[PDB]
Amino acid sequence: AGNATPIPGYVIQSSAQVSDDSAVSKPGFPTSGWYPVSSRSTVYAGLLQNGKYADPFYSTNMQNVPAAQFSVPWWYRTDLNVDDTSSRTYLDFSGVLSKADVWVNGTKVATKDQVNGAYTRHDLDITAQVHTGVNSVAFKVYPNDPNRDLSMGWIDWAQTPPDQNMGIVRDVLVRRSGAVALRSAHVIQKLNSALDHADLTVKADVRNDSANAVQTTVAGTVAGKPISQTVSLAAKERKTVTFPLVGLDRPNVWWPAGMGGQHRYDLDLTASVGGTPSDAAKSKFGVRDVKATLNSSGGRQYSVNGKPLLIRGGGYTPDLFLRWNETAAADKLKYVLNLGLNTVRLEGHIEPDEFFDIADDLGVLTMPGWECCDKWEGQVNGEEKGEPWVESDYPIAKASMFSEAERLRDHPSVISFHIGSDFAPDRRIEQGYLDAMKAADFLLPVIPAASARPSPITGASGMKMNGPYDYVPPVYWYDKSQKDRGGAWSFNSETSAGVDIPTMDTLKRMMSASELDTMWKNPSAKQYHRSSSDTFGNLKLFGDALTKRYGASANLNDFVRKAQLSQYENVRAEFESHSRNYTDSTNPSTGLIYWMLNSPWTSLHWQLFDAYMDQNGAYYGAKKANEPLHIQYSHDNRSVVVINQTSNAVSGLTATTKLYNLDGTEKYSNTKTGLSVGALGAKATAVTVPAVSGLSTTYLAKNVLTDSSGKEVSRNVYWLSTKADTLNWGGSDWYYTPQSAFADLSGLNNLGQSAVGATANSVAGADGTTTTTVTLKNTSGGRLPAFYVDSKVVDSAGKPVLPVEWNDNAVSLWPGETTTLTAKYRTADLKGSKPSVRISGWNTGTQTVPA
Numbered sequence: 001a002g003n004a005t006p007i008p009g010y011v012i013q014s015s016a017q018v019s020d021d022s023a024v025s026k027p028g029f030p031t032s033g034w035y036p037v038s039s040r041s042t043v044y045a046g047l048l049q050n051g052k053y054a055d056p057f058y059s060t061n062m063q064n065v066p067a068a069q070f071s072v073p074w075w076y077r078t079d080l081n082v083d084d085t086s087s088r089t090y091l092d093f094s095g096v097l098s099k100a101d102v103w104v105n106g107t108k109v110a111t112k113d114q115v116n117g118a119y120t121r122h123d124l125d126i127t128a129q130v131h132t133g134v135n136s137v138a139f140k141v142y143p144n145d146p147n148r149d150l151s152m153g154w155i156d157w158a159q160t161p162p163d164q165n166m167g168i169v170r171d172v173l174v175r176r177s178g179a180v181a182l183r184s185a186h187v188i189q190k191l192n193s194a195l196d197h198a199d200l201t202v203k204a205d206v207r208n209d210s211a212n213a214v215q216t217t218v219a220g221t222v223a224g225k226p227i228s229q230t231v232s233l234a235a236k237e238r239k240t241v242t243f244p245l246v247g248l249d250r251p252n253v254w255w256p257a258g259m260g261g262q263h264r265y266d267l268d269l270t271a272s273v274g275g276t277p278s279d280a281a282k283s284k285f286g287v288r289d290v291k292a293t294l295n296s297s298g299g300r301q302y303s304v305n306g307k308p309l310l311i312r313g314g315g316y317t318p319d320l321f322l323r324w325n326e327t328a329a330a331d332k333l334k335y336v337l338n339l340g341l342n343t344v345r346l347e348g349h350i351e352p353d354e355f356f357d358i359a360d361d362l363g364v365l366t367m368p369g370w371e372c373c374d375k376w377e378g379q380v381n382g383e384e385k386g387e388p389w390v391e392s393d394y395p396i397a398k399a400s401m402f403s404e405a406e407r408l409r410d411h412p413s414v415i416s417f418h419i420g421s422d423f424a425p426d427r428r429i430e431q432g433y434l435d436a437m438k439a440a441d442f443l444l445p446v447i448p449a450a451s452a453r454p455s456p457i458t459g460a461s462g463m464k465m466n467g468p469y470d471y472v473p474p475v476y477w478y479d480k481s482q483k484d485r486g487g488a489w490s491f492n493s494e495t496s497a498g499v500d501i502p503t504m505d506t507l508k509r510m511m512s513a514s515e516l517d518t519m520w521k522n523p524s525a526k527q528y529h530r531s532s533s534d535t536f537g538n539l540k541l542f543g544d545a546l547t548k549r550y551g552a553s554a555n556l557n558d559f560v561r562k563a564q565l566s567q568y569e570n571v572r573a574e575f576e577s578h579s580r581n582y583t584d585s586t587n588p589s590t591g592l593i594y595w596m597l598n599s600p601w602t603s604l605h606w607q608l609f610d611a612y613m614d615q616n617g618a619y620y621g622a623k624k625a626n627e628p629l630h631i632q633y634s635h636d637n638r639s640v641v642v643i644n645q646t647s648n649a650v651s652g653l654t655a656t657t658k659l660y661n662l663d664g665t666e667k668y669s670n671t672k673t674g675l676s677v678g679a680l681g682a683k684a685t686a687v688t689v690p691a692v693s694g695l696s697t698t699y700l701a702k703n704v705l706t707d708s709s710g711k712e713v714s715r716n717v718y719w720l721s722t723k724a725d726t727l728n729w730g731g732s733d734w735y736y737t738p739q740s741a742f743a744d745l746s747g748l749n750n751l752g753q754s755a756v757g758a759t760a761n762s763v764a765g766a767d768g769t770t771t772t773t774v775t776l777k778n779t780s781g782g783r784l785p786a787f788y789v790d791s792k793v794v795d796s797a798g799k800p801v802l803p804v805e806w807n808d809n810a811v812s813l814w815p816g817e818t819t820t821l822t823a824k825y826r827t828a829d830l831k832g833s834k835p836s837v838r839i840s841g842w843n844t845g846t847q848t849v850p851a
């Protein structure tokens with residue numbers, strides 16, 4: 001008694017092949033030719049699992065899937081054994097897209113009118129229907145239409161999954177307990193402002209589902225303190241048990257990564273009846289305080305544990321077909337940290353519990369909320385996809401808020417819930433959301449929208465969604481003059497410069513030779529792996545600025561090499577600008593969510609890391625920007641700026657800024673010593689680079705930060721032009737601002753050959769990981785830097801070992817200079833091969849060294 005076991009898997013088939021719905025869940029039902037699938041599968045995932053269609057990640061494979069078959073229901077069916085019918089039996093689940101009939105042993109226990117909406121939780125007492133031995137359960141899962149159903153959809157991020165994700169994407173728990181069922185155990189936690197004392201209020205529901213009145217004792221531990229309450233329950237009665245306040249002295253406060261540890265406490269409760277355990281629940285919570293208030297400029301400002309914070313993050317997405325794997329979730333979040341980011345946004349598609357656990361454990365902050373552009377906003381978004389709400393929609397959306405509030409309330413990573421995205425909810429829908437949260441004791445900041453749209457009750461959003469979402473040059477980010485644009489000011493909830501060409505290794509796995517030929521030759525042509533949206537269907541704006549700024553592409557390799565430079569440069573400036581302006585007295589930047597962190601699939605835009613966890617110019621660019629102790633060059637005013645992200649003020653820093661023509665001639669040098677800079681996003685200005693006579697059209701700026709012990713702590717190399725990027729502001733659309741003039745960076749085409757310079761070694765650790773160390777030296781006999789040198793852990797065939805975490809990469813080294821790099825990865829991902837390192841540079845060619 002106190003049992004909860006996930007159904008491990010099902011066999012599935014279309015309802016096309018089922019003429020008697022009641023037959024499915026009778027024990028002995030034949031399933032010849034049904035598809036075996038693991039827990040958490042959409043129909044199409046399940047069919048991929050059985051190898052029924054080709055790899056959707058490659059080319060247009062996904063188009064060749066007949067989608068008609070997903071406009072009818074599919075059954076999810078499994079046996080369940082019950083050795084003893086002393087215990088009551090429950091199905092507890094969520095994640096049904098879009099709705100389902102639930103059947104046990106030939107009886108319909110619930111219909112799609114009740115079991116409706118992806119986020120709604122259901123706790124079905126199936127005691128009457130369960131017998132000794134073999135029992136069976138079947139879900140008739142109805143088709144998903146994200147515009148019709150309070151569910152999940154893909155907006156314009158990728159292309160539409162053939163099944164629109166229908167199926168059961170979270171676990172179904174089979175629960176067993178006595179007369180009393182224990183549900184919804186949480187801990188309300190309140191930290192004093194000094195962070196040295198907390199008050200914990202444990203609440204938990206007991207439900208008596210027996211025929212007779214009972215006395216139940218709910219007892220156990222919170223944070224290692226004993227607790228006990230005894231209440232009476234009438235037959236069929238459910239109560240909320242509030243426990244007396246527990247004081248917790250000098251708590252182990254949960255902090256964001258790099259600000260402290262990520263301790264979580266345990267709540268462990270047993271409901272007993274008649275001196276015997278009836279049900280039990282274990283959970284965790286973190287002791288932490290969060291706020292998100294409007295500053296004096298109307299900007300939404302977050303703080304954790306009293307500490308103000310520039311949110312620096314990206315929009316997280318799951319797999320396009322909602323295929324779940326815990327390790328991969330963890331790898332994805334681990335990359336957030338490798339990037340130097342502190343936050344991920346979840347525009348809908350809110351992930352299963354474990355994702356929040358991992359987030360908690362690693363100290364990555366999360367911004368979950370509902371999504372735009374479909375049913376969720378169908379009642380306030382007018383002409384945009386998403387159907388106006390009917391009366392039955394209201395209780396489903398309210399039940400969805402409650403369920404999520406309940407799942408999410410105790411995860412310290414969560415800093416807010418967005419109740420709208422593009423459109424704030426109206427007063428009726430908003431009251432529904434506030435009531436649901438109140439009832440779940442969900443006490444986090446509620447943000448009305450991610451755009452500037454206010455809601456009637458909560459009010460101003462303190463954010464903006466002004467774009468861009470496609471190509472803009474670096475200096476665009478430094479704008480504070482255009483208040484309908486996406487410059488570094490207020491809270492940038494979702495923005496990027498669009499196209500993000502992945503590594504050549506990802507390219508070759510995701511597109512044909514012909515597809516790739518077209519991409520570089522005709523950026524204007526439609527690419528299946530960008531977007532279903534006509535607006536983001538092609539790479540025209542990107543191709544156009546690429547040619548203009550770096551020069552026309554001679555071939556695929558040329559296109560890709562320049563693509564990476566552009567993405568690095570662009571993403572770098574996007575974050576750097578927001579970091580700099582965070583400490584403006586007037587309209588500070590309070591947030592940045594890059595659009596996006598990752599893609600749901602193999603893609604050509606809106607990503608820092610690709611679907612295979614490979615790392616390109618955009619990744620390395622985000623990583624440079626987000627260094628904890630960082631030196632940066634402002635593209636607007638040519639000031640060299642030091643940013644300290646750490647939880648401690650730093651002193652005795654020197655900032656060295658040097659300019660070089662492409663022939664290697666130093667044309668400017670400045671050394672600023674004894675720099676202090678405060679903690680947590682504060683900045684300091686080293687120098688403003690003056691205009692310098694005699695710079696080559698394309699030149700380099702070498703920015704170096706060294707601490708008091710002389711250690712180089714940040715190195716930052718910019719390829720700059722004597723010719724400015726300038727904006728045609730009045731030509732701005734919602735998704736970009738075109739350029740009145742373009743920079744000339746094409747000199748890189750003729751940057752002379754340098755050389756490197758490489759040694760490598762690997763240690764297999766006892767923790768299951770290998771650390772490959774690589775020493776790079778510029779070994780040339782001249783004056784030329786080894787520019788943009790990318791190191792890759794590869795196996796013996798030269799295929800990248802992924803996921804991987806480097807301390808630094810994409811380095812530039814001047815003659816004689818040396819750097820030592822560290823790469824870490826699971827030993828098992830070598831798949832038995834010895835490790836090597838592939839080293840390629842803009843002007844140093846490609847070599848691979850054993851390691």
Ligand SMILES: N[C@H]1CN2CC[C@H](O)[C@@H]2[C@@H](O)[C@@H]1O
Binds near residue numbers: 422
């Ligand atoms: N929140 C929305 C806001 N949209 C504005 C432009 C783009 O369609 C973007 C969506 O990707 C995103 O999902």
